[PDB]
């Protein structure tokens, strides 16, 4: 999420061990580090062009994505830099030989390289414990907005 200010904390926000020598005059001010998570997830340009910090970013942060890769649909985007997604699924009950709609809400960290909105479908990678509840990180936005501008005014 984030937006604005960058340097908006009591601590200086920096990427660890990424020195920019002041003697060396540079036309980009700050030297930035990035990587790619793997599994073919393109590290979007908003992460390389960006100026934010997010050490919990999977592309510009200090977290590795490994283990599960899941998808859900975004139902809450109110926590700063993290969301909650719903994962529906039908559970099979033998005795009756039918299914019943179940769901679970996974909390997942979201880098400010993604502009996420409630409703979008998101693809999420498992990673080490980020918070009390967050065990996942948004690694791909498979949606957009759901024809938001196609609800505009009259002729």
């Amino acid at each position: 999420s984030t937006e604005l200010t960058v340097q908006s904390e009591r601590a200086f926000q920096k990427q660890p061990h990424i020195f920019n020598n002041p003697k060396v005059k540079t036309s980009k001010r700050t030297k930035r580090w990035y990587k790619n998570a793997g599994l073919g997830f393109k590290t979007p340009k908003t992460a390389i062009e960006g100026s934010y910090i997010d050490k919990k970013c999977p592309f510009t942060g200090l977290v590795s994505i490994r283990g599960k890769i899941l998808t859900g649909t975004v139902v809450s985007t109110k926590m700063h830099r993290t969301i909650v997604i719903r994962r529906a699924y039908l559970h099979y009950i033998p005795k009756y030989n039918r299914y019943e709609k179940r769901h679970k809400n996974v909390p997942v960290h979201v880098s400010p390289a993604f502009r996420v909105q409630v409703g979008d479908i998101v693809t999420v990678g498992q990673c080490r414990p980020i918070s009390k509840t967050v065990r996942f990180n948004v690694v791909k936005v498979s949606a957009a907005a759901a024809x938001x501008x196609x609800x505009x005014x009259x002729x």
Partner: protein, 260 residues
């Protein structure tokens, strides 16, 4: 539960030892060693349950405490020592040389080999890392670490080892079409060449296999141990050559060789 488990309940013991259900409450807990608990064979089970050279375990300690057994070259005086796959058991007296190598039913079979073939072994490299002071090292499934190996050696290749000294004298890369011996799963004990490897980034590469009867089967990369070229192995395989026969096939084989 507060610390390491020193006992082993006979029943929790691995089934490929073929220990009898009753006649006791425990089994030998394999000592820590070169081979994983569940894929080892303790010297007491070999010197006594496979080889019948003892009756008590008390006699297995009597045999062993006289340096009769020597494993892969060194003497070894551990009753429950975790002998394992590719290891060379060697009795100076009796002039016998055994190599541990799987059945086709998936067990460790008593395999007698020459006095000369019993002075080298195969070891699937499990990792190859650039060690301390820039010295690269290669470490093989049986817990051998060997400095300064060939550059072309990478993980999953297999390796011929001196036994006398430690040095690597040959190595077979993991390429489609190379004699393969399955080390785990229900296809454990089979042998057959390789078809091709399914990739799957993030976990568990599948290894398509075909044996010398045009029978196919898949296993995980973890369970594949390269041992040579089609036809030409590199060590003496056991009878049946890891082909696996159906229940019917085996019934006719055993009930055709019957004329007293």
């Amino acid at each position: 539960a507060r610390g390491p488990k020193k006992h082993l309940k006979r029943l929790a013991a691995p089934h490929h030892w073929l220990l009898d259900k009753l006649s006791g409450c425990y089994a030998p807990r394999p000592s820590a060693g070169p081979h994983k608990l569940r894929e080892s064979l303790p010297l007491i089970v070999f010197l006594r349950n496979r080889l019948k050279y003892a009756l008590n375990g008390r006699e297995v300690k009597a045999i062993l405490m006289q340096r009769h057994v020597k494993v892969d070259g060194k003497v070894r005086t551990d009753t429950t020592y975790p002998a394992g796959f590719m290891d060379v058991i060697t009795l100076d007296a009796t002039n016998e040389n055994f190599r541990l190598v799987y059945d086709v039913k998936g067990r460790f079979a008593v395999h007698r080999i020459t006095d000369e073939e019993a002075s080298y072994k195969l070891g699937k490299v499990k990792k190859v890392q650039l060690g301390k002071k820039g010295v690269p090292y290669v470490v093989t499934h049986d817990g051998r670490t060997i400095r300064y190996p060939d550059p072309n050696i990478k993980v999953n290749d297999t390796v011929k080892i001196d036994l006398a000294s430690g040095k690597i004298t040959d190595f077979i890369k993991f390429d489609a079409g190379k004699l393969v011996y399955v080390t785990g799963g229900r296809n454990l004990g089979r042998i057959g060449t390789i078809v091709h490897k399914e990739r799957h980034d993030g976990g568990f590469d599948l290894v398509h296999i075909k044996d010398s009867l045009d029978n196919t089967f898949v296993t995980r990369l973890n369970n594949v141990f390269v041992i040579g070229e089609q036809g030409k192995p590199y060590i003496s395989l056991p009878k049946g050559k890891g082909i696996k026969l159906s229940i019917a096939e085996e019934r006719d084989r055993r009930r055709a060789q019957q004329g007293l």
